[PDB]
């Protein structure tokens, strides 16, 4: 089996299209199964965003919940997780209008 | 890696707002120089190309500098080298436009 | 600034060679099911540079079609498509016809 | 050590060439067993044949009936003790 995959919503060769708007909530729904999996939200290109309060929140059953999203967050956000050496990555494409 | 058909993902990143090589004519300034010919007639610079994910957002430079590059000034008994400086971008960023 | 790019390289990096150009994808058919293509631009290898004189033009000596997967956001849960372009492998300075 | 008679210059020799005429790339050498390659960036490289393109140690490359392909920068290349030496030559025509 493939069981051992960190990411719940399988696939990601095409990112999930997420509608968003500036000033409001942004949820990058790359929810893992097991609570304690190290997930790092990126954003093409080289700027990783790290959890904390509002400006980034990590939730195992939900995902990265960004309060007051900006244009800085418009585009391809990648969620990464290394499990037994293998680097799994799930993709999410945002936009407006 | 991801098809003879360039995969989506590989297509997006490739065509994303970054600094890239663009051919540019010789600068008004070294177009005035007293020289029989200027070699080469163009210089390639690094400039914020690609595109943003919106009509609203424009790909602009957050890091930049002037490149001094020597141009050949064929002239006289002997040709010599002259210095051409112009705008070149290193860091780029997709930012909101102006009205 | 940095260092003065030596003439050799100024010339080297200014001759007729295949080089990456940003191709905005507005020119073609833009009606589909209503929406926008993603990305709304592509990068492709194309003959560029300047030739020795006005007499010579910089033309391709080898090219091909590039099929590139493009996502077209719209109604409803929108679908991913294809397009072909002209990529250049080798170039040369030919006299203008 | 250096194979080419003229010391290296950042400035290449200028040659006033013309199509259909004879072109000489006068990169003569100092020693007789040197394999000199005439290169032409991007990647064009003129291989001598004994007639149409003639190599000669006391003169250089001799090209009867020059073409448009020969307009631009031509670089004589030579490798001595691994050390690659090049002499650049810029050709141009009228107008």
Task: Report how far Cα B19 is from the mean position of its chain's Cα atoms.
Answer: 8
Instruction: Determine the residue of chain A that is closest to C76 in CA distance.
Output: A17
In 3D space, the residue among D31, D28, D30, D74 whose CA is nearest the CA of residue D55 turns out to be: D28
Instruction: Name the token pair of B97.
Output: 């436009």
Domain spanning A1-97: which CATH class is it, in words?
Answer: mainly beta
DSSP letter for C4, please: P
Question: Cis peptide before B40, with omega less than 30 degrees from 0?
Answer: yes
According to CATH, the topology of domain B1-99 is 2.10.90
- Chain D within 8 Å of C6 (Cβ-Cβ)? yes
In 3D space, the residue among C43, C26, C57 whose CA is nearest the CA of residue C87 turns out to be: C43
Which residues are registered as beta bridge partners of A77? A92
Handedness of CA A10, A15, A17, A21 (dihedral sign): positive
Q: B89 Cβ partners below 8 Å, 6+ apart?
A: B19, B46, B47, B48, B61, B63, B64
- Residue A71 has φ and ψ, to the nearest 5°, of -65, -30
**Residue A7 · residue A79 · CB < 8 Å:** yes
Q: Say if the Cβ atoms of C73 and A14 lie within 8 Å.
A: no
Q: Which sequence spans correspond to the domains of chain C?
A: 1-97
What resolution in angstroms does the PDB record give?
2.7
**Residue B55 · residue B98 · CB < 8 Å:** no
Residue found by looking up tokens 């990265």 in the block: A64
- Chain D within 8 Å of B81 (Cβ-Cβ)? yes
DSSP letter for C8, please: H
- What is the C-alpha to C-alpha distance for residues B6 and B4, in angstroms, rounded to an integer? 6
Give A33 to chain B, closest Cα distance, Å: 25
Q: Say if the Cβ atoms of D11 and B39 lie within 8 Å.
A: no
Coil vs helix vs strand at C49: coil
Contact partners for chain C, using 3 or more CB pairs closer than 8 A, are A, B, D
Q: Say if the Cβ atoms of D11 and B79 lie within 8 Å.
A: yes
Helix (H) or strand (E) holding B11: helix B10-14
Inspect the structure and tell me whether chains A and D have 3 or more CB pairs less than 8 Å apart.
Answer: no
Q: Which architecture, in CATH terms, is C1-97?
A: Ribbon (2.10)
Task: Report how far Cα A14 is from the mean position of its chain's Cα atoms.
Answer: 14
For strands A86-95 and A16-19, give the pairing.
parallel
In whole angstroms, how far apart are CA C60 and each of A65, C19, C57, D81?
Answer: 50, 11, 10, 38
In 3D space, the residue among B9, C70, C26, C78 whose CA is nearest the CA of residue A19 turns out to be: C78
The secondary structure of chain A, three-state, reads: CCCCCCECCCCCCCCEEEECCCCCCEEECCCECCCCCCCEECECCECCCCCCCCCCCCCCCCCEEECCCCHHHCCEEEEEEEECCEEEEEEEEEECC
- Chain D within 8 Å of C56 (Cβ-Cβ)? yes
In 3D space, the residue among A8, A18, A31 whose CA is nearest the CA of residue A75 turns out to be: A18
Q: How many CB pairs under 8 A join A and C?
A: 10
Instruction: Name the token pair of C22.
Output: 């940003």
Buried b (16+ CB within 10 A) or exposed e, B34-53: ebeebbbbbbbbbbbbbbbb
Is residue B32 packed enough to be buried (19+ CB in 10 Å), middle (13-18) or exposed (0-12)? exposed
Resolved by:
X-ray
In 3D space, the residue among D28, D6, B50 whose CA is nearest the CA of residue A44 turns out to be: B50
Residue found by looking up tokens 């006033």 in the block: D16
Strand ranges across the sheet with B37-39: B37-39, B57-74, B80-96
The secondary structure of C51-69, three-state, reads: CCCCCEEEEEEEEEECCEC
Give the N- to C-terminal CA distance of chain C in Å, as an integer.
Answer: 41
Instruction: Name the token pair of B65.
Output: 């500098």
Q: Which sequence spans correspond to the domains of chain D?
A: 1-95
Inspect the structure and tell me whether chains A and C have 3 or more CB pairs less than 8 Å apart.
Answer: yes
Which residues are registered as beta bridge partners of D63? D23, D53
- Residue A28 has φ and ψ, to the nearest 5°, of -95, 95
Instruction: Name the token pair of D51.
Output: 């007639």
Instruction: Determine the residue of chain A that is closest to C80 in CA distance.
Output: A14
Q: Say if the Cβ atoms of D93 and C91 lie within 8 Å.
A: no
**Residue C70 · residue C83 · CB < 8 Å:** yes
DSSP letter for A73, please: G
**Residue A82 · residue A44 · CB < 8 Å:** no
Strand ranges across the sheet with D53-56: D23-25, D60-63, D53-56
Residues in chain C: 97
Q: Which of C6, C16, C53 sits opposite D92 (nearest CB)?
A: C53
Instruction: Name the token pair of D92.
Output: 């141009």
According to CATH, the topology of domain D1-95 is Immunoglobulin-like (2.60.40)
**Residue D4 · residue D26 · CB < 8 Å:** no
For strands A76-83 and A86-95, give the pairing.
antiparallel
């Amino acid at each position: 089996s493939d069981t051992g995959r960190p990411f719940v919503e399988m696939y990601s060769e095409i990112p999930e299209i997420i509608h968003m708007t500036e000033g409001r909530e942004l949820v990058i729904p790359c929810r893992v199964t097991s609570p304690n999996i190290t997930v790092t939200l990126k954003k093409f290109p080289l700027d990783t965003l790290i959890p904390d309060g509002k400006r980034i929140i990590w939730d195992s059953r939900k995902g990265f919940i960004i309060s007051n999203a900006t244009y800085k967050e418009i585009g391809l956000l990648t969620c990464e997780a290394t499990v037994n050496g293998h680097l799994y990555k799930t993709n999410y494409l945002t936009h407006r209008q | 890696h991801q098809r003879k058909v360039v995969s989506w993902i590989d297509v997006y990143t490739r065509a994303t707002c970054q600094p890239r090589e663009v051919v540019v004519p010789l600068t008004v300034e070294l177009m005035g120089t007293v020289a029989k010919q200027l070699v080469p007639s163009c210089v390639t610079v690094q400039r914020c190309g690609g595109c943003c994910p919106d009509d609203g957002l424009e790909c602009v430079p957050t890091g930049q500098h002037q490149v001094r590059m020597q141009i050949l000034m064929i002239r006289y008994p002997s040709s010599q080298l002259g210095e051409m400086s112009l705008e070149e971008h290193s860091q780029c960023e997709c930012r909101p436009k102006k009205k």
